[PDB]
Write a protein that binds this ligand. Structure first.
Ligand SMILES: [Fe+2]
Ligand SMILES: [Fe+2]
Ligand SMILES: [Fe+2]
Ligand SMILES: [Fe+2]
Lengths: 289, 289, 289, 289
């Protein structure tokens, strides 16, 4: 269909990854209407995160929030690459944070990031290897429903695409899901938590909560299996390789998408800045009370 | 009426805010009788806080403690601006702390202040924006019954009045109090605590436990409402603007008064020193055992 | 009677305070027999504290341990001033610690001292006011049964005697013990603990757990009473003033003795070093199992 | 018998201590096959510890894991001295860690080492006294089943042999095991834990959880007994004195072996580097579900 304030087109890498682009009129109006709250105001007063969310959704005739929720919750999709025309330079990092915040807080709430002390975190990489596919939030009890990763800056960067794996594109899903250890609660440590690497959604379809660094196999049986699982994920033919240009961000359902990052070329002048948010879904629906 | 040791007159800003002034004979006698305990003695031995309280009340023929309790607990009032003639210069900061301590510990006990490590805290501001109305103690389980804010120093200060809002002067009270989210326990974080923004006193009248920085709306529904609540409070026509000259302190019922601070003019030589205490009420009354 | 290895004579200040002096043959033999364990060995391996205790008691034909327990547990007494001939100079501080350790671990076990990180602590004072009478261990749940305070060094020291008050020499005991607030559990804070300032021993006789710095009266009623209690203790005619020369230590029952320290004369060359241990009683007795 | 990939011969010190030596073909093949995972990879992803374990066991035709478990669990034995030909120089410390990791994770899992922050720890000693026999893990609730101690470097080292005591070579075992205090839970502190110094295996045979530094006797009775126990262990005629050359490691059952270290000669150029791992057993067996 045709949407108010933005366009939605499938990506070249996969029909499951949809590209959402806010128009120029939508973008400059949003930035104008949220100009009176700097990013530090969003940091200090969390309800402003929801206020700028509403402002953005209002500028899209309230078509954005239902579209975001539909896409992220659709098992067939669950992934967005989002950008706003005119917001594509590192000098607009604050506008980038505002826009991502507004998008994230239409579908839920972003959790505290221990590495930044805020509801979002920015990293710069300077001075090489593939970051293996994984889910976020595997070492805490609360489920992380979504991962938001935004490219703030990118200079002298060859490679480094975001890697994505939708569980239903993973050719080995059934082999590992049907193994008894898939249901075995395992220890995860950054207090420790225990949960299986696999679970099911409400329909019985597999979801995952996996990362190689924080899973703690208790014995030879668990360790060998996890090392085979790791291999079966990293060599999967279903992995997507997605460039994320400055100003764009991926927003993915953390339960049936795994994400990672490809190796990049070391270069003295290399600078890549990322912004991340992770949170849970929260939305109105017709259900029992 | 006429009181022993002090005078009580309504303020120019509101009949709910009463000005209590200790006479010169009362003030110099109190300071004499408490001279043997410096402020550091009140810090180290908390029962001395109550001893100087009794000394002050005794010098007022025991009319002070019942008057303080009557005023602070009276829904129609609940707020005092207190001073002592001759105590009006920053060089008398210790006398100021002693006097405020004696007053506070006639009606209750001042709680530990994490920012100072003592039962009171002093701030100096040097080197601009309005501090929004709020209640203290919203992020701990124990109720903060009273807020004490004392002007220790003020130099080259244009503006910066204390802002006050009595809930019964808030023209939007019923609109927000009657909303279902008014009774929804929300998360507050500086361990997290959960409580609604609104509650009731013993008679069913609204009281509040609100601050925009520490309330953590869990979703879009809560966030938008809190952002409207914030606006409805900050633009209320009922807000009082009270100058607090050096040596005076506000003492207010933290349950149905919100407090804040107006914007002030930045000035190189600007110095404003404040002293704060927060605590709970504790007092004798005829009730069942 | 006549004891093996030591003498026992009443002090000049009170028949309740007994002076125990280890003879020269007892002292040099003990130091010889414990020479192979330096103080740091007693710090690292707590069972050595009991080994040197046994060694000392064995050198007294096993008359020391029963005498120590009898004296410390006797309501009429409960206090010892202990020394060993030839151990009276700060250069013998390690011998002092060994001797005090052996004595303490015949009657119980010394608790971890947070200020030193060991089962004992040494302080030096250099660069004035009376330290009010009190019990130790009032802000933890476990009862501190005994206090051991040893004079390691004393130079250019006028005054500074240890102050002692046996509850049965306190002329106001009955007045405060019979007050309802004597049985009121009050908050003590250095996690907080709650216990009354007064309690009873197994026979119903008053014992105390009081210090002015850490008791936290919750309201005007408790604060005024504690401030009167404090005054009634500090002005008691029953207070003993005991010089503690280098090499001597007081060992007192912390339940019915309060201890403190008199004011001393400031002097540029003043140096006083103390060693303290606090612990619980533990001893064999004929009782039911 | 004859094993695939390694040889097994009894030590000169005791038939209970078996020497396991990986052949050159086994060693160079293992190092080749695990070359793609550096030690830091084993630190960050614990399942790789089990992957290199399997790789090593596969190179021994799967005869290694059952042999390791049989030996460590055999009451008559329970101790291995393990090495790999060609791995005997401090410059091969990473190969040493890889090999020890593979061995340890065939029989169980190595626990987090608080002193290193990793599943193993390396110490260097430079700049004298005997380290008394003891068990590891006495101050936590979880049982430490095995201790792994590897000699990484040794220069200008006279003495310093590892000391070992198998409980069934301890001529005083029955005397202390039959004492009532052997079954008395005692306090151990580095939260505190309580457990007896002695326990039994599944057959009722004594096992121990003892160290002199962390056991905290509560009274004279416990302290004197522990000090006699300590003496009876340290003077036992059953103690083995085992040189551990660079590249070799002891792997012992921590329940019925105590370990320690002999005094060594201080020397300006002395350098000895050790690597330790401690963990629990975990292995497949036929038992009820
Ligand atoms: Fe991630
Ligand atoms: Fe405030
Ligand atoms: Fe004391
Ligand atoms: Fe050890």
């Amino acid at each position: 269909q045709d949407y108010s304030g933005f366009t939605l087109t499938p990506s070249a890498q996969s029909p499951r990854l949809l590209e959402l682009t806010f128009t120029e009129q939508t973008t400059k109006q949003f930035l104008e209407q949220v100009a009176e709250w700097p990013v530090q105001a969003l940091e200090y007063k969390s309800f402003l995160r929801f206020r700028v969310a509403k402002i953005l959704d209002d500028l899209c005739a309230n078509q954005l929030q239902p579209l975001l929720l539909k896409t992220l919750l659709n098992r067939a999709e669950g992934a967005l690459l989002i950008n706003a025309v005119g917001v594509d330079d590192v000098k607009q990092a604050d506008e980038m944070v505002k826009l991502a915040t507004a998008v994230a807080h239409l579908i839920g709430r972003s959790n505290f990031d221990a590495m930044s002390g805020q509801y979002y975190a920015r990293f710069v990489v300077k001075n090489h290897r593939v970051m293996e596919l994984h889910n976020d939030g595997t070492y805490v009890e609360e489920i992380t429903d979504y991962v938001l990763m935004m490219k703030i800056d990118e200079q002298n960067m060859q490679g480094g695409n975001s890697l994505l794996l939708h569980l239903d594109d993973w050719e080995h899903l059934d082999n590992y899901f049907r193994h008894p250890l898939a249901r075995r609660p395992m220890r995860f440590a950054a207090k420790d938590v225990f949960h299986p690497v696999f679970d099911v959604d409400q329909q019985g379809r597999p979801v995952m909560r996996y990362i190689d660094q924080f899973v703690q196999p208790k014995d030879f049986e668990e360790g060998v299996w996890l090392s085979e699982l790791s291999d079966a994920i990293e060599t999967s033919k279903g992995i997507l390789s997605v460039p994320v240009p400055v100003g764009k961000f991926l927003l993915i359902n953390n339960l049936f998408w795994l994400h990672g990052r490809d190796r990049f070329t070391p270069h003295p002048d290399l600078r890549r800045e990322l912004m991340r948010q992770r949170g849970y879904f929260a939305y109105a629906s017709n259900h029992y009370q």
